[PDB]
Design a protein around this ligand. Sequence first.
Ligand SMILES: O=C(NC1CCN(S(=O)(=O)C[C@H]2CC[C@H](NCCCC(F)(F)F)CC2)CC1)c1cc(C2CC2)on1
Ligand SMILES: Nc1ncnc2c1ncn2[C@@H]1O[C@H](CSCC[C@H](N)C(=O)O)[C@@H](O)[C@H]1O
Ligand SMILES: [Mg+2]
Ligand SMILES: [Mg+2]
Ligand SMILES: [Zn+2]
Ligand SMILES: [Zn+2]
Ligand SMILES: [Zn+2]
Length: 426
Amino acid sequence: PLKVEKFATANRGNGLRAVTPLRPGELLFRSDPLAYTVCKGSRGVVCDRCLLGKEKLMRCSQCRVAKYCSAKCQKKAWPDHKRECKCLKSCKPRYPPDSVRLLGRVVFKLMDGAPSESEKLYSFYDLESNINKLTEDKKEGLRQLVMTFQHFMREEIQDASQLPPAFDLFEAFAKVICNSFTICNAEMQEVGVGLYPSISLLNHSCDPNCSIVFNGPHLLLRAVRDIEVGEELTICYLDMLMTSEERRKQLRDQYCFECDCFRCQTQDKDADMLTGDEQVWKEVQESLKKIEELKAHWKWEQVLAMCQAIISSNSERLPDINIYQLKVLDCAMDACINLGLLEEALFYGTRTMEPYRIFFPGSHPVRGVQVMKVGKLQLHQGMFPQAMKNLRLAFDIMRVTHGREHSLIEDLILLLEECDANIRAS
Ligand SMILES: O=C(NC1CCN(S(=O)(=O)C[C@H]2CC[C@H](NCCCC(F)(F)F)CC2)CC1)c1cc(C2CC2)on1
Ligand SMILES: Nc1ncnc2c1ncn2[C@@H]1O[C@H](CSCC[C@H](N)C(=O)O)[C@@H](O)[C@H]1O
Ligand SMILES: [Mg+2]
Ligand SMILES: [Mg+2]
Ligand SMILES: [Zn+2]
Ligand SMILES: [Zn+2]
Ligand SMILES: [Zn+2]
């Protein structure tokens, strides 16, 4: 018995609404992807199948592009990799855009696979394309993706009889652009891109009543507020650390809509997000383009070097509540954790705690993860009362956003028991 149902909204296309009253933390839907792939930066760093990082990965011998954590993952991935393998090998050394590799997997799944549970409420065929809202520049970009797909897939798909009935590649890429999900690992690093057509029914809010979280490729949809019968379910499509102007640009560019929510009408939190000297944070925002690229490719030493030059600059500095400063602290923290620089990681992480309380109101999985990271760093440094407070706060958030079905909650329970045993021996 589903707790959610598809419906036709008055002015947002189709949507999802509650069939029963919902409480924070309630699991509403869970889904594997219709199709997914590792993303550009994480290719060869994480396993193609389970999206977990490993010090050494085994490569597919035929294409040498797909890489796996284990013989189990390589073999289990073979049915969904078999046809793309010949295309990837034929295209070497050229690697396709993520969207092109993704749509290849969509096509093979729809041609060769049984009907997917991911499409229970809504299918790839049903997805919004927004084609009549596309500007000419966007249509041109989609045409180039179509031609890139035809080149990449030529070994496996030569004509329309090898595509699903009435399949239009331009329309398919339009759907991919507006309906791709960024798959994040347990630490909230972007590691993949996938299509989850039933989850695509969720419309956007900058102050949503639901949240999604990834456990490998698996997606969990949970309520994060009380929700009444008939009430529309929403998620936030975007990073919370964005001004209303930034959200406006991305929602127009990628999703072809103008957001009418209260936060956008009132520029909610914009002024607090942009405190400090504008010339300074404009420079930091510029530097973050490279920092974000380095982080996406797991280049932690390079990330840390650039972040330290900002955090410890000889020149003017920013308040930690400035969102570009905050992003630099976040990246520096994550780099230090991955490099084993645990004292420095804790310094940066502790500084983010109050800004995160302000910018992630309610129960948000990203703040849950951040607080867990800080609590774990404090546990390792022997600060048991401080660690316990943060681990308990992380649990209060993550019991709602992640839940028992997410493996990170089991990890958190072990940290809480270890911290508690230390306190009791003191
Ligand atoms: O992919 C979808 N949403 C995303 C929203 C964002 N999250 S997140 O949980 O906040 C994790 C993010 C936290 C920030 C992190 N970036 C930090 C970079 C900072 C810099 F630049 F300084 F380096 C990246 C991960 C993931 C899911 C989606 C699609 C749809 C379709 C339209 C239906 O809905 N939702
Ligand atoms: N808050 C919002 N206001 C207006 N349109 C929205 C919206 N959130 C999502 N959408 C629409 O939904 C698309 C994302 S997919 C969400 C389901 C979609 N409404 C459908 O009918 O299939 C966006 O590109 C936009 O067309
Ligand atoms: Mg349509
Ligand atoms: Mg329309
Ligand atoms: Zn694996
Ligand atoms: Zn291969
Ligand atoms: Zn809004």
